[PDB]
């Protein structure tokens, strides 16, 4: 199966250099091109550049002065370097496999969110949203992290039906907060174990929080 | 650069009915009797997913209700029988001329029956209170349409300036929205008051429903 995965720093200071890596599997970089595309939050898609199968590069002219794409076929990796970053470079960065003859981008990585900011990295505090009293709701409050994003799974991905993870809100403090909730049977609250798995990649923080009645 | 202009910007469609999305290009996207216009589906927190390549070719694993047509400067994606899981932003993509460019996107939503929110209220954890902040959370679960009012009451005194709201995009199975409201007090102000209530107004409720707790908490 064709897979790509982006890796990035999360936070980059203004005027510094953004470094990203795209690791590929299920295909060879000798056969396929790889493109970099970014998406500012709640905006459209902007193409940055491509590493061709043969090892040549093609760049969006607006990034010519700041952008370098390189690869190592033998390490299954394509790299991006974007110098002199400003707030305008805040985006989810995607790497995509490109069909070399047609320019069709057929497989995309999950993406890495790059925040350009002078502020400090900060991992979240995780608090339970405990059930009380057919249907019961429980959750986790993920408070006071920077930058975005946080991802939440339930019972290491075993529980998915009824899960709602809300968009993060920016608090007046300048730190993000989000809640993740799941609706379950009322009869299950006593017996069944519920753990939210909170991942904050920008701070390399992983928090498991058991959620149970008061 | 080739500019791609999509139409509509957004549309609400009933389950089983037709969605038509147009993409126009500022220049021809054809070379040697081949059209280099492609269509993507993007759901929230996910990458674009290829639906159609070179105007009319359905990508493997994509259902046949998706189809594409057009050439030169005029292209159409059709979803013949819209399913719940097809709620997304749809993008056209040209690869004829450098730089490759994308359309501004088209938001597809399901128009479905009115659904009342199930309301839940969550007191702040003892863990959090030791930090000196109190977060009270009101959850509105699985409602249609999107429009909802949450009112926070503290000892029946209606709150203002000290809450924030977040709404999910439309659920891929039941086409509903969910909403969380968070009330943020200092531990001091939290301990001054007893009765905490969120009042939910919505089309699916005949009158506004209130969920509440006492800080005593059993
Ligand atoms: Cl080359
Ligand atoms: Cl192709």
Shortest CA distance from B97: residue in chain A: A103
Give the number of other CB atoms < 10 A from CB of residue B74.
13
Our CA-based measurement puts residue A119 at a distance from the nearest CA of chain B, in whole angstroms, of 22
CATH code reported for the domain at A125-210? 2.60.40.10
Q: Residue B166 and residue A169: Cβ atoms within 8 Å?
A: yes
Residues of chain A positioned with their CB less than 8 A from the CB of B29: none
Shortest CA distance from B211: residue in chain A: A133
- The torsion angles phi and psi of A127, rounded to 5 degrees, stand at -120, 145
Q: Residue B180 and residue A179: Cβ atoms within 8 Å?
A: yes
What are the C-alpha distances in Å from A5 to residues B42, B69, B218?
A: 17, 32, 48
Pair type for strands A18-25 and A176-185 = unpaired
- Could you state, in order of their start, the residue ranges of all structural domains in chain A? 3-116, 125-210
Is A124 an 8 Å CB contact of chain B?
A: no
Q: Residue B213 and residue A132: Cβ atoms within 8 Å?
A: yes
Burial of B42 (0-12, 13-18, 19+ CB in 10 A): middle
Instruction: DSSP letter for B187, please.
Output: H
Instruction: DSSP letter for A123, please.
Output: P
The topology (CATH level 3) of A3-116 is Immunoglobulin-like (2.60.40)
Report DSSP letters for B121-132, one per residue: EEPPPHHHHTTT
Shortest CA distance from A94: residue in chain B: B47
CA–CA separation, B90 vs B92, rounded Å? 7
Residue to substitute from A34, A129, A149, interface B, most B β-carbons within 10 A: A129
Q: What is the CA radius of gyration of chain A?
A: 20
Residues of chain B positioned with their CB less than 8 A from the CB of A132: 213
**In sequence order, what are the residues at sequence separation of 6 or more whose Cβ sits closer than 8 angstroms to the Cβ of residue A45?**
A37, A38, A39, B48, B91, B93, B102
Pair type for strands B88-94 and B66-71 = unpaired
Could you say which residues from 56 to 75 on chain A have a Cβ atom under 8 Å away from some Cβ of chain B? 58, 60-61
A3-116 and A125-210 agree in CATH topology? yes
Pair type for strands B157-158 and B163-167 = unpaired
Residues of chain A positioned with their CB less than 8 A from the CB of B48: 45, 94, 105, 108
Our CA-based measurement puts residue A141 at a distance from the nearest CA of chain B, in whole angstroms, of 9
A27, A10, A28, A32: which is closest to A19 by C-alpha? A10
Domains assigned to chain B? 4-110 (2.60.40.10), 118-214 (2.60.40.10)
Q: Please tell me whether residue A201 adopts helix, strand or coil conformation.
A: helix
Neighbours of ion ligand 2 (CB under 5 A): A 99, 102, 104; B 53
Are B70 and B78 in contact, with CB atoms under 8 Å apart? no
B172, B156, B168, B162: which is closest to B117 by C-alpha? B168
Q: Residue B38 and residue A105: Cβ atoms within 8 Å?
A: yes
CA–CA separation, B83 vs B65, rounded Å? 9
Experimental method of this PDB entry: X-ray
Please state whether the peptide bond connecting residue A147 to the residue before it is cis, i.e. omega within 30 degrees of 0: yes
Are B140 and B202 in contact, with CB atoms under 8 Å apart? yes
CA–CA separation, A56 vs A162, rounded Å? 47
Resolution limit in angstroms? 2.1
Pair type for strands B101-102 and B106-110 = unpaired
């Amino acid at each position: 199966e064709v897979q790509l995965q982006e890796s990035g720093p999360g936070l980059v200071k203004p005027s510094e250099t953004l470094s990203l890596t795209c690791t590929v599997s299920g295909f060879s970089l000798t056969n396929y091109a790889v493109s970099w595309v970014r998406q500012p939050p709640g905006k459209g898609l902007e193409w940055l550049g491509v590493m061709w199968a043969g090892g040549g590069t093609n760049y969006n002219s607006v990034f010519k002065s700041r952008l370098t794409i390189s690869k190592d076929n033998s390490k299954n990796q394509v790299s991006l370097k974007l110098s002199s970053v400003t707030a305008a470079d805040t985006a989810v960065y995607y790497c995509a496999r490109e069909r070399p003859l047609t320019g069709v981008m057929d497989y995309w990585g999950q993406g890495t969110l790059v925040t350009v900011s002078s502020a400090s990295t900060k991992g979240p505090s995780v608090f339970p949203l405990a059930p009380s009293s057919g249907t019961a709701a429980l959750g986790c409050l993920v408070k006071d992290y920077f930058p975005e994003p946080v991802t939440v799974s339930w019972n290491s991905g075993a529980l998915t039906s009824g899960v709602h993870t809300f968009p993060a809100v920016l608090q007046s403090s300048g730190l993000y907060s989000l809640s993740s909730v799941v609706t379950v049977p009322s009869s299950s609250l006593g017996t069944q174990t519920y753990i939210c798995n909170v991942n904050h990649k920008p701070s390399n923080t992983k928090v498991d929080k058991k959620v149970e009645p008061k | 650069d080739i500019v791609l202009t999509q139409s509509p910007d957004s549309l609400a469609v009933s389950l089983g009915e037709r969605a038509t999305i147009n993409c126009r290009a500022s220049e021809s996207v054809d070379y040697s009797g081949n059209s280099f216009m492609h269509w993507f589906q993007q759901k929230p927190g996910q990458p674009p997913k290829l639906l159609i390549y070179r105007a009319s070719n359905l990508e493997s694993g994509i259902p046949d209700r998706f189809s594409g047509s057009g050439s030169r400067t005029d292209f159409t994606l059709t979803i013949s029988s819209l399913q719940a899981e097809d709620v997304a932003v749809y993008y056209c993509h040209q690869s004829n001329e450098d730089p490759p460019t994308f359309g501004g996107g088209t938001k597809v939503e399901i128009k479905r029956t009115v659904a009342a929110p199930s309301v839940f209220i969550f007191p702040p954890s003892d863990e959090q209170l030791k930090s000196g902040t109190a977060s009270v959370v009101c959850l509105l679960n699985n409602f249609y349409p999107r429009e909802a009012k949450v009112q926070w009451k503290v000892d029946n005194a209606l709150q203002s300036g000290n809450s924030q709201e977040s709404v999910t995009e439309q659920d891929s199975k039941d086409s509903t929205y969910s909403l969380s409201s968070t009330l943020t007090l200092s531990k001091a102000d939290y301990e001054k008051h007893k009765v905490y209530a969120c009042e939910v107004t919505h089309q699916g409720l005949s009158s506004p429903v209130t969920k509440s707790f006492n800080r005593g908490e059993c």
